[PDB]
């Protein structure tokens, strides 16, 4: 699954 | 330890060709078992391997989501990190990130990952606690101050110890005939001769699974770390690995050179040597 | 940063003159990841070349694999030709039965 990633 | 679940996604910026592709592939150690590429004519999350398939629509349908929304999230970071090295619009850049989890033979996280990677070099990554980072320039420092302020590293250690370690478990279960199988590398020595005086002795190792291996030569007992030529690791297009060392050694000598195979498919490690 | 491919041509099991297999090209360590890889049949680009989907090693550096079906004999020599930033013009690599 998948992981919501973050603006850097 | 015994496994791993890994995400590794490319985003790269190129100027006057379109916005930045980007591609995800999911791997349970060596085996790939997914993939999202921005490029794909309909991007969607799709099966690598046979035992996701089975894993129902809405499975497809959140993953699928997840990746066009980190496409986006991609895309304005490949715009930020241009600013943050004051960056033209006219270069191509990567961005670059991993992020899983290890468990234990019994399932248990052994430790979680979310690291990043801009143009080759090392950027920023959540630490082994899951609660700081390391940025590793001024650049990176502005990601982990964001970061920070948003509560970042608690998003990905409630994802690495928890949605990680839990999916990790049911894929392992879903194709644990593949998954959980490890097939011992075929091993053989082959020798070359170069001229009159010396001869290469290869050491094969074939049809491997997973691709962590360790072959080595030693000439009296003595490993010959300096003088052994060392492919790297190939896939062989099955699943399986392929790998060689050589050594040249003086003709008539060859008896005195021994290659040790480790591989956890194998219950004692190999020694070999040639045999004509 | 560029990083230069290493580059492996070899086949999926050991060949056999007249015996189907699989002609493999496997880069590695390069970056960025625009790569160009040809397979060769006596200079002449096969067509019908997949590949693996693009991932990179712990150390950020790409790989792929490229590969085709086909028929060793003595007769036919079989090559990689591969193009990245790194490189001036394509480096080919000539499929060696022992390598």
Redesign the interface.
């Known amino acids: ?8 | 330890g015994s496994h791993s679940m890994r995400y590794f996604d490319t985003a790269m910026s190129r100027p006057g060709r379109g916005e930045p592709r980007f591609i995800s592939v999911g791997y349970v150690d060596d085996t790939q078992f997914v993939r999202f590429d921005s490029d794909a004519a309909s991007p969607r999350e799709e099966p690598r391997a046979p035992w996701i398939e089975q894993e129902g629509p809405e499975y497809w349908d959140r993953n699928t989501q997840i990746f066009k929304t980190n496409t986006q999230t991609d895309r304005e970071s490949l715009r930020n990190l241009r600013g943050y090295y004051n960056q033209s619009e006219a270069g191509s850049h990567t961005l670059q990130s991993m992020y899983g989890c290890d468990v234990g033979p019994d399932g248990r996280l052994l430790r979680g990952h979310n690291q990043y990677a801009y143009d080759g070099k090392d950027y920023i990554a959540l630490n082994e606690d899951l609660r700081s980072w390391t940025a590793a320039d001024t650049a990176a420092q502005i990601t982990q101050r964001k970061w920070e302020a948003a509560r970042v590293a608690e998003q990905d250690r409630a994802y690495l110890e928890g949605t990680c370690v839990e999916w990790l478990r049911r894929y392992l279960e879903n194709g644990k005939d593949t998954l959980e199988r490890a097939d011992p590398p075929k091993t053989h020595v082959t020798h070359h001769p170069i001229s009159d005086h010396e001869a290469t002795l290869r050491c094969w190792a074939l049809g491997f699974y997973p691709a962590e291996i360790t072959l080595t030569w030693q000439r009296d007992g003595e490993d010959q770390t300096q003088d052994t030529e060392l492919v790297e690791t190939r896939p062989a297009g099955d699943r399986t690995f392929q790998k060689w060392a050589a050594v040249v050694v003086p003709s008539g000598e060859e008896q005195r050179y021994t290659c040790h195979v480790q591989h956890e498919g194998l219950p004692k490690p190999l020694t070999l040597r040639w045999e004509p | 940063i560029q990083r230069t491919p290493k580059i492996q041509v070899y086949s999926r099991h050991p060949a056999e003159n007249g015996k189907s297999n699989f002609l493999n090209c496997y880069v590695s360590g390069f970056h960025p990841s625009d790569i160009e890889v040809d397979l060769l049949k006596n200079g002449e680009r096969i067509e019908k070349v997949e590949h693996s989907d693009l991932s990179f090693s712990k150390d950020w550096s790409f790989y792929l694999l490229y590969y085709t079906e086909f028929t060793p004999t003595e007769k036919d020599e079989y090559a990689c030709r591969v193009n990245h930033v790194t490189l001036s013009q394509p480096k080919i690599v000539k499929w060696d039965r022992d390598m």
């Open positions: 699954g998948g992981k919501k990633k973050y603006q850097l």
